[PDB]
Each structure stands twice: as structure tokens, then as C-alpha cells.
């Protein structure tokens, strides 16, 4: 309807000329900014799946595993191959047959909840769901069941957004309120080591559990036998979620939305300052039995979901602070809580989701402190 055409309205009152930006352009720019991370995530998921399958099985056993799962036999039908000499085309196709069902079911179910609430409360259906659906489908593991994906997006849309009123009226992160529902409800399929590498019968840990086990010397990639260098964890050759692994593509995508004024360099610098300060404190303290006290900042930055969280999920405008003085505090709190949940909490090997969902409650307190200082400065007759 009004997706193709601008509405052709005119202004009725005081400002007879307006800007040129709208929620359509803003949310479509943020939706385009994660396309490099999407394409690399599909490539890397396919590469890890093929490497694990050819490390485990071989020959007729590999043929029996291939002909017994539709992600493998469809990929070999459409033209690719599942042997060790696979191309980037076959790797991205095998990543696509894992990612695209999750994106499809998340978009359709969340769109149904959007349309139902919008028909009941008699509004016009707005954007922002374009951002929420892709950010949800890019942070769940590549082996997540479709019904759990539907439940996660149902919780995220209904309980966190559409009860409070829609776009611009909630207070949490709707893409992370759904993942927290999945993470605390069905944690057998979103934790561990059976879930991250999208293979069959591959049980091997990842980069943040290997450090917490045995330090930087235990960062070995069991599929290939090689070791995980910093350039590998920076380029994005590690197991993990779909589109979180590549810090280079995340920086390349988020430099544009930082330049355009949509994402906030205040929050990004706050998260970086908090991470650096707490990780340096833990380095200088040091411990003999906890192997995470001596993880430097240039390793905290690249592993897990720190770069995706800091760039695309800590910079949500509706949930953040509204003051320039409070955005630094909100970012610093996010960084401190992320490094703290990583280092000293042993049940969870990564803490960016819980850090963001914890600072979303204390952002309006920082708003209140800054605006109360301003009200005192006003009552003293200087503002």
C-alpha cells in the first residue's frame, strides 16, 4: 500500500516546510546495515558445517548423513557439494538453508502479531519490525527449531512492545526480550556445545568456553586442528550465532549508521570505555584459578557477541537514555556489566544480552539525575 509510494500529504499548520527523513528511511537504513553480517554469517555457517561433517564422517557414512537430512540433500540437489573442496557458493547456500527458514518464520509470526494489534487499536502498521525481525533472526544459533523461533518472536513483540503501545513507546529491547525468553525457557537448545556448529553429531565447544576452561592456549579449533588467531576471531572464522562472528563486517556496516546520525557514538564510546576499564582492572588483579581474569581488551572485543551488541543493540533509541550526559553512563554500565558477567559469573559464558537488559531499567534513572541537576540550575535562575 504505502510501502511503494510516499503519501503525498501536505502540512496543515505552523511549519509549512519539513525535513526529509522518516521512520521508513531510518529503519530501512538500519535494516540494510546488517546485510554484510548476514551474508558473512551464512558463509561461515556453511563453512563450519562442511568442515565438521568432513572431520567426523567420510565416504559412504558421509553419503548416508547427507541423504538423511534435508539441509544437506537439498544443498547437494541445487548444484553444490558437501565434500571437503566446497566453494563459497556451496557454503553460502548451506548457510542459507539454515538461516532463511528462521527469518521467514520470525517475520511472518511477528508480522501477524503486529497486524492484529494494529487492527484492534485502529492505527496504521509502522516500521521498526523490519529491524526487530532481522536482529532477532541474526542472534539465535543456526540450529534453532522453528517453533521456538516463533515463540521467541511472539514473546518479544507482544509482551515487550505491543502491550506498551507499539514503536517508540516501550522501554526494553524487543529483540532481546525474546531471546531472553528463549534463553531462560529452553536453554538446552540455546547453550552448550551441541548447538553452535550446525552439523550432525558434532559436539565441540566454542571460543569463550575454551578460554574459561584453560586460557588462551586452549583456543584450538577441533574441526580443522588449527588454532584460533586474533585475525581469525576478528575476520569471523569462529563458531557462534548466525551473524555475530565477524567484527570486521559489523564495523563496516555500523560506520555508515554512525556517520548518518542514526546510531549514537556516545553509547558506543561508553560501552568501549566500560569494557576497557573493567577488563584492565581484572588483568591487574589477576587470579591463579580463574583463567578469564587475564583476557585482554582486544580479545574481549572480538569474541562472542560484544561487537554486535555494542553496535546494533545497545544503540536502540527508544530504550536508551535521552540526555547526552546520561548516554555515556548508560554505555559505561553496559560495558561494565558485560565484562562482569563474562568474567565472574560461571553459568553463562557471555553476558551482553543480560547487560543490555539490565541497563535498560536504569537508563531513565540517569535521565532523572541529569534533568534534576538541570532543574536546580534553572531554579538558580541560569537556564
Amino acid at each position: 500500500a504505502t510501502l511503494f509510494y510516499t503519501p503525498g500529504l501536505v502540512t496543515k499548520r505552523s511549519s509549512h516546510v519539513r525535513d526529509s527523513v522518516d521512520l521508513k528511511r531510518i529503519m530501512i537504513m538500519v535494516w540494510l546495515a546488517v546485510f554484510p553480517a548476514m551474508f558473512w554469517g551464512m558463509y561461515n555457517a556453511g563453512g563450519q558445517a562442511i568442515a565438521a561433517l568432513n572431520h567426523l564422517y567420510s565416504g559412504d557414512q558421509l553419503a548416508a548423513i547427507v541423504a538423511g537430512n534435508w539441509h544437506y540433500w537439498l544443498t547437494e540437489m541445487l548444484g553444490g557439494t558437501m565434500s571437503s573442496d566446497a566453494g563459497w557458493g556451496s557454503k553460502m547456500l548451506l548457510g542459507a538453508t539454515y538461516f532463511l527458514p528462521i527469518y521467514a518464520t520470525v517475520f511472518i509470526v511477528g508480522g501477524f502479531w503486529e497486524v492484529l494489534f494494529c487492527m484492534v487499536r485502529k492505527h496504521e502498521v509502522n516500521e521498526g519490525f523490519f529491524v526487530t525481525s532481522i536482529l532477532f533472526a541474526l542472534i539465535v544459533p543456526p540450529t534453532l527449531p522453528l517453533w521456538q523461533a516463533a515463540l521467541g518472536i511472539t514473546f518479544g513483540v507482544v509482551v515487550a512492545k505491543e502491550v506498551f503501545g507499539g514503536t517508540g513507546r516501550n522501554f526494553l529491547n524487543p529483540a532481546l526480550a525474546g531471546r531472553a525468553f528463549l534463553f531462560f525457557a529452553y536453554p538446552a537448545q540455546i547453550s552448550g556445545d551441541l548447538v553452535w556448529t550446525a552439523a550432525d553429531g558434532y559436539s565441540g565447544a566454542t571460543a569463550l568456553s575454551q578460554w574459561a576452561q584453560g586460557g588462551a592456549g586452549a583456543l584450538i579449533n577441533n574441526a580443522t586442528g588449527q588454532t584460533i588467531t586474533w585475525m581469525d576471531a576478528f575476520i569471523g572464522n569462529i563458531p557462534g550465532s548466525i551473524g555475530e562472528v565477524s567484527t570486521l563486517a559489523l564495523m563496516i556496516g555500523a560506520a555508515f549508521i554512525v556517520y548518518m546520525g542514526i546510531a549514537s557514538w556516545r553509547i558506543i564510546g561508553g560501552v568501549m570505555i566500560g569494557m576497557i576499564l573493567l577488563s584492565t582492572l581484572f588483568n591487574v588483579i589477576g587470579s591463579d584459578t580463574n583463567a578469564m581474569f587475564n583476557m585482554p581488551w582486544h580479545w574481549h572485543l572480538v569474541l562472542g557477541g560484544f561487537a554486535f551488541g555494542m553496535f546494533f543493540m545497545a544503540t536502540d533509541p527508544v530504550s536508551a537514555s535521552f540526555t547526552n550526559s546520561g548516554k555515556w553512563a548508560y554505555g559505561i554500565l553496559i560495558g561494565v556489566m558485560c565484562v562482569l558477567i563474562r568474567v565472574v559469573n560461571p553459568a553463562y559464558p557471555e553476558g551482553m544480552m543480560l547487560a543490555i537488559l539490565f541497563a535498560n531499567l536504569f537508563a531513565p534513572l540517569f535521565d532523572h539525575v541529569v534533568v534534576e541537576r538541570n532543574i536546580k540550575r534553572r531554579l538558580a535562575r541560569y537556564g
Binding site: 525468553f181 531462560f184 525457557a185 529452553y186 536453554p187
Partner: protein, 206 residues
């Protein structure tokens, strides 16, 4: 029959967790299992009824200075007797109700009724009001416990209803139902349903 409307006013017209906000901590922390929900419903009903009856019996001679001390003495003696009887004949449920067999003293329903209705009425309508508010509270306990226990472990009173995967069935339990956020959400949507079936309890917009 005045007793019918007296016991059936607070089941849906004046529900103590829906319209008033009294007795929420026990509603959040007992409803994990339907057996403990039933036992807590019965115990709060018993304590509220007998407390209202006694404080209405001596309502003329209670002084203005130490009315709080006298009311908490009566409620605390009743709850200590209830606790000894539970620990003697219902020991496993008493273990599952670890500290909340003491917090019936500081539950707000018992003292709110003993202050609002007990001090200005007759013992028999006081007893009836206590029973009615116990019922109106047990309704919310029972519904939240039904949804939480069923969707979170596939059981009702311990009886197996939905066969789990570990046994070999088809259901995989929702691990969030055993935590208090699920109680919060279920009570919120129950208030939505109650106030959309009865629209004279809508909070007026400011």
C-alpha cells in the same frame, strides 16, 4: 440469602489481587505447584476467618494505643498453631513452603481485613468476610498454579498429564514457568481478562 452475596462479592467483584493489591508475594512464590497452592489457600482462609472472628469479638475493649500489637499477637498465635499442625501432618508440603508458612502473619489480606471489616462489624459477618476473601485469593492462586505447573512440568497435582521427552513422550517443559516472571505475566494477563469482561474496574486515565 445475604451470605451468598457476602462470600461471592470478592471472587470477581473485589478480588484481593485484582482490584485491591493485597497478598502478592505469596501469589508469586507458592504457585509453582498446585498442591502448595491449595494448602496455602486453605491456610490463609483459615487464618483470615478466625482472626476476623476474634478481633471482632473483642473489638470494644481494644485500646487506641496498642491495637497493632494486639492484632499481630492474635494473628501470630493462629499462624504458629497452623505451622505446628502443618509440620506435624503435612511435612513435605511444609518443607516446600519453606518461609511462607511464617509470612501469613505479614500477609496483607489478613491484617487489611482485620482492620477494615473486623473492627466495625459483628463476629458472624466478620467470619463470612474472611472466608469470602480467602476464596477470592485462592481463585488467583489456583489459576496461576494451574497454568504454571501444567506448562512448566506437564503435571497436575503430581498426576502425569503431558508425557515428557525424558520419559519418552512428546512435550518439552517450559523452563520459565518455574520462575517468578511467569507468575508476573500470568497475573497481568488475568487482570486484563477480568477487567475486559467487567469494565467498571478500568483505571481512569490521568
Amino acid at each position: 440469602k445475604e451470605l451468598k452475596k457476602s462470600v461471592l462479592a470478592p471472587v470477581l467483584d473485589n478480588n484481593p489481587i485484582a482490584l485491591q493489591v493485597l497478598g502478592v508475594c505469596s501469589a508469586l512464590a507458592v504457585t509453582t505447584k498446585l498442591e502448595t497452592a491449595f494448602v496455602m489457600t486453605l491456610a490463609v482462609m483459615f487464618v483470615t476467618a478466625l482472626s476476623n472472628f476474634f478481633v471482632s469479638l473483642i473489638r470494644n475493649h481494644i485500646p487506641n494505643s496498642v491495637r497493632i500489637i494486639v492484632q499481630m499477637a492474635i494473628i501470630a498465635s493462629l499462624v504458629i498453631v497452623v505451622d505446628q499442625i502443618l509440620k506435624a501432618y503435612l511435612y513435605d508440603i511444609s518443607k516446600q513452603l519453606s518461609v511462607f508458612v511464617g509470612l501469613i502473619i505479614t500477609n496483607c489480606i489478613v491484617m487489611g481485613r482485620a482492620e477494615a471489616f473486623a473492627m466495625k462489624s459483628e463476629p458472624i459477618p466478620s467470619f463470612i468476610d474472611g472466608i469470602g476473601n480467602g476464596l477470592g485469593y485462592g481463585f488467583v492462586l489456583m489459576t496461576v498454579g494451574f497454568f504454571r505447573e501444567l506448562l512448566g512440568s506437564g503435571k497436575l497435582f503430581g498426576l502425569e498429564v503431558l508425557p515428557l521427552i525424558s520419559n519418552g513422550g512428546w512435550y518439552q517443559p517450559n523452563g520459565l514457568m518455574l520462575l517468578a516472571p511467569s507468575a508476573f505475566f500470568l497475573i497481568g494477563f488475568m487482570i486484563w481478562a477480568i477487567r475486559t469482561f467487567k469494565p467498571e474496574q478500568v483505571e481512569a486515565k490521568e
